[PDB]
Subunit: 386 residues, 3 copies
Amino acid sequence: SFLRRNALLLLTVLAVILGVVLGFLLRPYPLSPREVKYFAFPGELLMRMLKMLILPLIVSSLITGLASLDAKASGRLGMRAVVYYMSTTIIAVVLGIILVLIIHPKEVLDCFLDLARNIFPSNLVSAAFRSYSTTYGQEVEGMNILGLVVFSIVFGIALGKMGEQGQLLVDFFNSLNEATMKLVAIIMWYAPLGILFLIAGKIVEMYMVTVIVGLVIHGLIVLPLIYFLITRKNPFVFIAGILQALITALGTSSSSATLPITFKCLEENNGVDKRITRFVLPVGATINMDGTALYEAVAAIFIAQIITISITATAASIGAAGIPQAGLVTMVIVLTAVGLPTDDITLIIAVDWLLDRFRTMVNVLGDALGAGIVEHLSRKELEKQD
Amino acid sequence: SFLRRNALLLLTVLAVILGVVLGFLLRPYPLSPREVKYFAFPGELLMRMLKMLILPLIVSSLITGLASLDAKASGRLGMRAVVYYMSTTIIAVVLGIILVLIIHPKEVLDCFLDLARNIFPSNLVSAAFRSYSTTYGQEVEGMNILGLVVFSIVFGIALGKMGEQGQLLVDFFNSLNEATMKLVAIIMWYAPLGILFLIAGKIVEMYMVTVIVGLVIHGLIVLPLIYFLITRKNPFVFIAGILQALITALGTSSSSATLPITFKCLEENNGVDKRITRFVLPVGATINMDGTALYEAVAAIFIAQIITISITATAASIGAAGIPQAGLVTMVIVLTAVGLPTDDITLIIAVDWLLDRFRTMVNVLGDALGAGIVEHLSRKELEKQD
Amino acid sequence: SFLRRNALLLLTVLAVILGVVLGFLLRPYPLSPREVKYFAFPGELLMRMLKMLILPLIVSSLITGLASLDAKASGRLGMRAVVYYMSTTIIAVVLGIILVLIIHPKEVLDCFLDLARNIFPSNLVSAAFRSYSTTYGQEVEGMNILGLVVFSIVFGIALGKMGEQGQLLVDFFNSLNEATMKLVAIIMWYAPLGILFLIAGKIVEMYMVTVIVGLVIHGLIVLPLIYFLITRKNPFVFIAGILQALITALGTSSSSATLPITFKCLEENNGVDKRITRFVLPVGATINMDGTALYEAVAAIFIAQIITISITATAASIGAAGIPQAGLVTMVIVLTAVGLPTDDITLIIAVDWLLDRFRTMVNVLGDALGAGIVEHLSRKELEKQD
Ligand SMILES: COc1ccc([C@@H]2C(C#N)=C(N)OC3=C2C(=O)C[C@@H](c2cccc4ccccc24)C3)cc1
Ligand SMILES: COc1ccc([C@@H]2C(C#N)=C(N)OC3=C2C(=O)C[C@@H](c2cccc4ccccc24)C3)cc1
Ligand SMILES: COc1ccc([C@@H]2C(C#N)=C(N)OC3=C2C(=O)C[C@@H](c2cccc4ccccc24)C3)cc1
Ligand SMILES: [Ba+2]
Ligand SMILES: [Ba+2]
Ligand SMILES: [Ba+2]
Ligand SMILES: [Ba+2]
Ligand SMILES: [Ba+2]
Ligand SMILES: [Ba+2]
Ligand SMILES: [Rb+]
Ligand SMILES: [Rb+]
Ligand SMILES: [Rb+]
């Protein structure tokens, strides 16, 4: 009965172990890294299929998400969601400093300007695939999620204040979100074939231990106890539904790439209201620092062998939303403010390929558990609409 | 009562004087021009917020603008609008020659080919952010307004001939125009904070006098007397409404960047019919040469110290719609036809930063006063639809 | 009466002869090839006008084409269409080997990977104008038709399974297809002026004979006899309607560029059902190899003076959908698998300018005659919907 009910998640569990085993079976690499790319190809296709659906999901989710909700109420439960994104990050930043205290193993100012320049895009067509970042054309390949999310929020809320006239395109983007979420059903089945070929190509190439210690204790103790404190419901039962999304989080290593799956794992598996998931999930894929700030704060102290380092590490990953090799460049810029050499970066690249997979896993769990706290803390607002 | 009724325009007047004063207070610049960019940043954000809204306003304005109007009648009042864009330019070109007579202070052929190549875009997605211009990829960053306006006009009129089937997406773009015009309400409030920081960063760096003499006499005598001749109504009362747009025209220095504000200053402040503003304003932001041809014709004679120079100067700025540093490159190409050195251009760049602000001010007033003449000369066509 | 009924096709026939005559009248070229570009300009404008309409036609045709049809039935008549695209190619590849037997006159593996990478686009906005192809950014200018067609098919069929919710945007893209097909009426009239100036600029610059022999025998014997075998109707009567599209196929030399005209020549001239033309024509503009594989297979044997060469030549042109100079680069990659020098390519470029015009003519006829066979072999499926 277990193999019949939960069939696809047992396949992804089989894909993780088979991906490690087959990868370790073909570990002595006599072939050039060019041939490794040809081997990791079936997993590379899944990423293209997922990246395809990021843009028409993020745009359509928020536009309907802020329109379905009253402009006055949505602005209030939105501030309630900010409470989660700020508190969990504060505890994580604090946890990172204690973690290195017991077990010790482009300009800086320009990144705060590029983040503000990315928030308000110059062209929405250019925002859909090019992100702004000052270089010495500043626009470079990689979706400007921070700009599209900002426009979608103010555009979506403008439709809530429109009513009669606005009703047309709101029904359009809801049908569009339903269309893009009907394409995700097929992408979920290609995931086992993808993941096993994707992680196998990435394996064939004490700080590492420090990171996982803090990441697991935050995702299994800190975050679930925050959920149990307000909702008064078991967190593992909520975790059981989002299992098909948390396993893919390791393979994808991007919260944006897993967003189409994470959406179905909350709306279908756990049974969470669409009106709040469409409001929490897109913002959470960029604003949430729970896992990525906890990874970057530990990275700064390890190579050095306090308030200024934390703020710079936060504004780094928010500025580099879904751009390829985001963690690689952001760690360089954060070292200019502290005054540390860039020679140590040549070693963390050969260890980030497995550590970034767990970084996303905490980030995806945070947005999912965040929506669970939001739903319970906004039940009266949701009943007002019905 | 005056401070209560007209509050935001008194703030922009305060922003202009405070922008000059604070700029002159911090005039001795010990900092590198890189730091000037960081200072002019709050005004740089307003430009990104305005450029954001250009594209979804221009596309949606014309599509509904030509569909709401009868395909037979719209084609006729359109020719009536061409009468304005041709006559005012002829008088301006003539005024420029008299102005230099009393007070004397890529190829040419390729620009006429690039203009024709820009009119019909090869790809509408590429047209939304890349303009065609031959270089020795010809497509370069900067919206192809000339191509999007052309498509929107023939696409919008195709919906007027569609009727029943076409009614769906016409109601979509009208709701979309209403959405983009509901976002402009917040951008209008960021303008005082923007303008004061934007003009201050631009101040810290007899021909100049000749230009303003011709520009003021055209905008305060020539254009208002043309309005008073047909409408038989006071032009200053019409100018009083568009005050919030004319002040921003100095700061933005682009007729396209001020189009979202100019739209509200005509539809809300002066109380002009949407059906004709959506028809006159987008075309006027590119086709109108009243101020920019009057600036370029005087530029040619001053550095030289007749029919061929005027036509080449007209087709230059129409070809370079909203592309950055349009006046800088177009003045180089116009000198090849007359046979004059490019050494004189190194001096006008340090004076254009204040002169281009008044160039746009005449251009924005021309499109606004043009719509006023169009409304009065097409009252019977508008009554036919009701 | 003949000049009155069929007026525009007699003009395009006049354009072909006048284009050759005027071109041969101005054959001794004393002007640099830069001036030839300025001469071929009125035909260059038609191509921009046609390329403009490719993207909003391909996207809107398939989305409504798979939604109007039942998800179960469409998947079946789709397999019936694959029968045509596979059988006609098999006969063509076989015909090419017999044609060279009687009358004898980036990596290879990467192209099979790039084709799979193009099928699933990473970003739909980027897919609308940039195609993926590995180079040693892989994304380069030229519409990713293979990616947009794939998305449109799975997105369109997702709307058929949506019903009530999906009904909104399906009526949108059908009105949009009707809009883009109402713009094509004016482009059809610019074609005679275009073609005569476009072919004249291309003329002023035994293998050639071998190609036309096989191309004419396939398009006038093989393909029409396949039509007459199933439909039991005269093929020349069906060819008579699509005459306005077949003449333009010579001028455009691209099946995608002629798609907007080919659509009207089937829906209006021959009177074919929209539901199947919108399903056959976009796929046929890329997947069909009837003419282009017959051109490339003969190209390999001529320069050499069997199963491995045919498969590589097929996957080459499908990978290079509508990208400029597709036949030039694909012939280089196919020679690496066989092991032949690239010195022979410097001669075929000066002969492809007339041979590629007939290559498309066979490809356009194949898609048109394919739709004719599909309609007759799916009459019962079409009656089920009514
Ligand atoms: C800096 O990064 C952000 C931007 C937004 C948010 C919140 C959020 C989430 N999650 C969503 N979906 O909507 C709103 C939020 C508000 O705080 C306020 C709320 C809102 C209401 C009314 C007018 C607004 C005008 C501008 C911005 C937000 C507005 C909408 C959080 C972080
Ligand atoms: C060269 O730059 C331009 C293009 C257009 C215009 C006029 C205009 C303004 N303002 C608008 N909104 O629509 C039309 C205009 C016509 O003259 C004619 C009118 C029109 C009616 C019917 C069919 C047409 C077909 C092609 C072009 C315009 C057409 C529309 C002016 C300058
Ligand atoms: C490789 O290049 C292609 C892709 C598609 C096609 C066929 C086609 C044509 N012509 C169209 N318009 O739709 C479908 C086709 C199917 O074979 C199958 C059919 C279909 C039905 C149901 C689910 C599908 C899921 C994925 C792909 C096709 C699907 C749609 C042919 C070649
Ligand atoms: Ba957080
Ligand atoms: Ba509402
Ligand atoms: Ba004018
Ligand atoms: Ba109408
Ligand atoms: Ba075929
Ligand atoms: Ba249906
Ligand atoms: Rb990541
Ligand atoms: Rb300007
Ligand atoms: Rb071709």
